[PDB]
Structure 1
């Protein structure tokens, strides 16, 4: 990331746009809740404003 080598979590949203979140801040991440671990949706990162 420009001078630091880190470990990240790998998250795939819609259109295969990947989001890496640090392992120092994994508490920002929660498990799923709708009871649809096979029927879960997928949002698009950054919205569809553009």
Structure 2
């Protein structure tokens, strides 16, 4: 991230737009609450802004 090393969480949302968040900020992550771990949908990052 500009000369530093880091470990991150790969999240593959819809259309394989990868998102990473550091392991330090793990409290931004929760398990799916709908009970549909084999039926969950897939959002796109940020939404259709433009």
TM-score by length of 2: 0.92
TM-score by length of 1: 0.92
Give ranges in structure 1 of 5+ residues lacking alignment.
none
Moved over 6 A (4+): none
Compute the RMSD of aligned alpha carbons: 0.7
Q: How many residues in Structure 1 have an aligned counterpart in Structure 2?
A: 50
Report how far residue 33 of structure 1 moved. Answer: 0.7
Report how far residue 49 of structure 1 moved. Answer: 2.8
